[PDB]
Amino acid sequence: KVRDQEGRINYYWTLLEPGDTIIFEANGNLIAPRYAFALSRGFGSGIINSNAPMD
Amino acid sequence: LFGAIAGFIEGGWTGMVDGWYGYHHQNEQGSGYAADQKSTQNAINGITNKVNSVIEKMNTQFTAVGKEFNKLERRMENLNKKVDDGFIDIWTYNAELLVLLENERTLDFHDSNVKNLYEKVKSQLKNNAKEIGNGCFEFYHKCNDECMESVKNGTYDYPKYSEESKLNREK
Numbered sequence: 001k002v003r004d005q006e007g008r009i010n011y012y013w014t015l016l017e018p019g020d021t022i023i024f025e026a027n028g029n030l031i032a033p034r035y036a037f038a039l040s041r042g043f044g045s046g047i048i049n050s051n052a053p054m055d
Numbered sequence: 056l057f058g059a060i061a062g063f064i065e066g067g068w069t070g071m072v073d074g075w076y077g078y079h080h081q082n083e084q085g086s087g088y089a090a091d092q093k094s095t096q097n098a099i100n101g102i103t104n105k106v107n108s109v110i111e112k113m114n115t116q117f118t119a120v121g122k123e124f125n126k127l128e129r130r131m132e133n134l135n136k137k138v139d140d141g142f143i144d145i146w147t148y149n150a151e152l153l154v155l156l157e158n159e160r161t162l163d164f165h166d167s168n169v170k171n172l173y174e175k176v177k178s179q180l181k182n183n184a185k186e187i188g189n190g191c192f193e194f195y196h197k198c199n200d201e202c203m204e205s206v207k208n209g210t211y212d213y214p215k216y217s218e219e220s221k222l223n224r225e226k
Binding site for chain 2: 043044045046047
């Protein structure tokens with residue numbers, strides 16, 4: 001029981017290319033997308049794990 | 056090494072505050088401390104360009120070192136660790152050795168500048184003055200502030216005092 005639950009939701013993601021179609025078929029057990037995100041790649045960066053004020 | 060600094064010239068002067076290399080004269084009017092502006096300026100230009108060459112030769116592009124991997128990718132984590140540690144080791148060795156060798160280049164440069172100044176003054180004075188060690192000259196003739204300044208800027212006029220110096224020397 002993680003977080004007072006025993007069933008699990010497995011999460012998946014994909015990157016639709018410009019001018020491409022995604023098809024969802026399901027007869028059960030689908031947590032459907034509602035909000036997607038439009039992205040443009042930037043300079044290679046990372047994530048900083050820190051406890052410091054932002055200025 | 057050239058033998059001037061910590062050599063035939065023993066120690067430095069806390070009195071001289073306007074430059075690295077210079078003169079200390081003693082006449083009837085008084086004593087003093089004057090820096091040789093030409094040699095000091097050349098040394099300043101050289102050292103400034105050395106420091107700038109060391110600093111501005113390091114150019115990088117926007118990079119992020121950190122990466123995260125899951126448990127089933129340990130050859131990844133180890134390869135990333137290897138590249139990081141290798142770059143750190145190479146840069147540490149290079150920086151340490153570069154500073155170590157450039158310190159000897161700078162100190163040798165200062166020693167050479169002092170020796171060159173001594174040799175210039177010696178060739179200017181010729182036999183009009185006597186060397187008494189410690190980088191110090193004793194005049195066979197009588198010099199005022201004009202003579203001292205003349206020795207300092209590089210226009211000594213040896214023939215002007217040659218006869219009097221000959222009379223005082225051969226006695």
